[PDB]
Structure 1
Amino acid sequence: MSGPERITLAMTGASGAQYGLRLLDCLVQEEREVHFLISKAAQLVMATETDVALPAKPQAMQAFLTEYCGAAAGQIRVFGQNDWMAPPASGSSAPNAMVICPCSTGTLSAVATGACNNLIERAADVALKERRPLVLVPREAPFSSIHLENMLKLSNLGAVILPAAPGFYHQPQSVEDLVDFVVARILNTLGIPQDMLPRWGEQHLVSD
């Protein structure tokens, strides 16, 4: 298996719920175990931007996402925002890679400062202290200096700052193609195979 067996996927309240849902689908299809976390604000983004009717409480949410993605029983493990007995809360847990997608400016802030006010924030704090992968996918424009400083500090500490800034160099034809671009780069960063975005120049041998 290339890449991590387990991914902590946290959705926070930036625009771009579709990115997180598509990533979840792809992780499931790649037979990975996903520890899924979602903020209250992200639930309201999802309701605003999609037709997904996500149940609010963890057990119902787990059953719903398992069906939605065609996952195996136990493959998607949902934890609530104060569930400190979940694996991501401790560095003594089995190792996971972590992705926050989308990453609100507020969660970016919390991670940069070490606020640890809920399980998402603590999970990121743990990832950093244990030197386990941490990928943040912010969606904001403009970025202020506040945002930039927070991203810089985290990138300097080894987090991957991967803005939801899709490329156009494969002539996207739909919204889904642009969503898939970002998801592909997340997967590439994690070392998980993907066939949505070709390997640039792989079959280019010499310059024209």
Structure 2
Amino acid sequence: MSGPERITLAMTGASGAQYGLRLLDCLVQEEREVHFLISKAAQLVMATQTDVALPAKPQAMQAFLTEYCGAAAGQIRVFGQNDWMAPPASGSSAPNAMVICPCSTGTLSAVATGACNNLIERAADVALKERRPLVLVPREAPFSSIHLENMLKLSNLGAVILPAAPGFYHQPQSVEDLVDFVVARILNTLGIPQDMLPRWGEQHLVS
């Protein structure tokens, strides 16, 4: 299989829960193991901007998402915000790629500064120290210079800053086509197969 076997998928409190849920579903379809984390503010976002009724507590959540995505048993793990027992808290864990989708400006700040307030922030601190893939998907506008400085510091280290800024080059017709464009770019960054967005110019031999 190309790309990582295990992804840590963290959802934080930016207005684009759609992207995290779509990504989780694609990752499940590509038979990857997902370690799923969600912040308190992301729960509010999902409750108010989606028609997904996500249970509050990690075990009920894990059962709900497993059902929602058609996952295999144990394919989606769910860890709470202070569960230091969980793999992402230590670099001695098995190698994961980590994606924060969507990434609030507060989580972006914490990763840039090393705050490690909760398991999402510590998981990203660990990704960085271990040189493991770390992809952040901010959704904010405008971006202030505070935001941009935090993104630049992290980009210069090797994190991938992938804004929820979908393109219009594959004839999008729906909200879902725009969500899929961003998800397709994430999966391309991770090295995981996807067929939602064609390979640009793959047919073009000359001119």
Per the shorter chain, which TM-score range? over 0.9
Deviation string for 1:43-96 (max 9, x for gaps)?
000011111000000000000000000000100000000000000000000000
Instruction: Give the distance between the partners of 1:175 and 1:66, measured in 2 at CA.
Output: 24
> Secondary structure of the equivalent of 2:61?
helix
Instruction: Give the distance between the partners of 2:170 and 2:68, measured in 1 at CA.
Output: 29
Instruction: Give the distance between the partners of 1:152 and 1:139, measured in 2 at CA.
Output: 16
> Secondary structure of the equivalent of 1:182?
helix
Match of 2:42 in 1: 42
Count the aligned residue pairs. 207
Q: Structure 1 segments of 4 or more deviating over 6 A?
A: none
Instruction: Give the distance between the partners of 2:169 and 2:28, measured in 1 at CA.
Output: 27
Match of 1:110 in 2: 110
Instruction: Give the distance between the partners of 2:140 and 2:112, measured in 1 at CA.
Output: 16
Instruction: Give the distance between the partners of 1:169 and 1:73, measured in 2 at CA.
Output: 38
Instruction: Give the distance between the partners of 1:30 and 1:169, measured in 2 at CA.
Output: 25
> Secondary structure of the equivalent of 1:135?
strand
Please, which runs of 5 or more residues in structure 1 have no aligned partner? none
1:165-184 alignment runs, 5 A limit: 165-184=165-184
Deviation at 1:132, TM superposition (A): 0.1
Deviation string for 1:153-181 (max 9, x for gaps)?
00000000000000001110000000000
Instruction: Give the distance between the partners of 1:66 and 1:205, measured in 2 at CA.
Output: 44
Q: Does 1:76 align with 2:76?
A: yes
Please, which runs of 5 or more residues in structure 2 have no aligned partner? none
Deviation string for 1:73-124 (max 9, x for gaps)?
1000000000000000000000000000000000000000000000000000
TM-score by length of 2: 1.00
Instruction: Give the distance between the partners of 1:28 and 1:150, measured in 2 at CA.
Output: 31
Instruction: Give the distance between the partners of 1:166 and 1:68, measured in 2 at CA.
Output: 25
Deviation string for 1:111-162 (max 9, x for gaps)?
0000000000000000000000000000000000000000000000000000
Deviation string for 1:15-41 (max 9, x for gaps)?
100000000000000000000000000
Instruction: Give the distance between the partners of 1:97 and 1:170, measured in 2 at CA.
Output: 27
Instruction: Give the distance between the partners of 2:28 and 2:169, measured in 1 at CA.
Output: 27
> Secondary structure of the equivalent of 1:166?
coil
1:22-41 alignment runs, 5 A limit: 22-41=22-41
